[PDB]
């Protein structure tokens, strides 16, 4: 039952923002039948057909379907310039080919303001405490937030989704949990943030006791 559906995915923010990484867009075709697994992909960048996309190994889903995937590397600045990426999918279980388009959100980019906030007085009685990195006023909502101490990533943090503020920009908060004794020691903790509007896509803010 179908036939197929197409989902077009944008690059990770971290890959578009870091020159040392490789952003790609991912055209995913699901519910491809075993009778007609053959899929034709057409890619375009601002309406112009490209030829450098690569097809991933076909993936048996074991539910009478395959997942068929085409990946297209994007240039960092092209993404960030708002160029349109189109994937067109043809297959014999399809009356018409399916077209899907994605690009960066349209709007005036806004720098995030980044503030680190210490645990509350009230939290000092517990085994672990919370460091908060408030990140507000950003646009668009593509952002990377990580924490570190003494050079090394901290992994024990969770970050809210971006949340839309009334002025159209976004905010979120990242909570880093550390043993109260690591905070007690006076260790320096850093909230690193990557977003297109910062100078060189990066800012870091630190705090300690």
């Amino acid at each position: 039952l179908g036939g197929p559906s197409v989902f077009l995915f944008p690059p990770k923010p971290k890959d578009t923002l870091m020159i040392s990484r490789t952003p790609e867009v991912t055209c995913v075709v699901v519910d491809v039948s075993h009778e007609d697994p053959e899929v034709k992909f057409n890619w375009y960048v601002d309406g112009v057909e490209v030829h450098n996309a690569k097809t991933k190994p076909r993936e048996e889903q074991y539910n009478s379907t395959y997942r068929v995937v085409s990946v297209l590397t994007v240039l960092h600045q092209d993404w960030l310039n708002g160029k349109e990426y189109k994937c067109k999918v043809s297959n014999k279980a399809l009356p018409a080919p399916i077209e899907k388009t994605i690009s960066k959100a349209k709007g005036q980019p806004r720098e995030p303001q980044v503030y680190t906030l210490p645990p509350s007085r009230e939290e000092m009685t517990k085994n672990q405490v919370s460091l908060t990195c408030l990140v507000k006023g950003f646009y668009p909502s593509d952002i990377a937030v990580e924490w570190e101490s003494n050079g090394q990533p901290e992994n024990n943090y969770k970050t809210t989704p971006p949340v839309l503020m009334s002025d159209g920009s976004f905010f979120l908060a990242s909570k880093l949990t550390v043993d109260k004794s690591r905070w007690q020691q006076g260790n320096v903790f850093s909230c690193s943030v990557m977003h297109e509007a910062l100078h060189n896509h990066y800012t870091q803010k630190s705090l300690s006791l």
Partner: peptide, 13 residues
């Protein structure tokens, strides 16, 4: 200048 994050290059201008 350039930004680095954990010894990996972010961006330069």
């Amino acid at each position: 200048d350039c930004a680095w994050h954990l010894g990996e290059l972010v961006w330069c201008t």
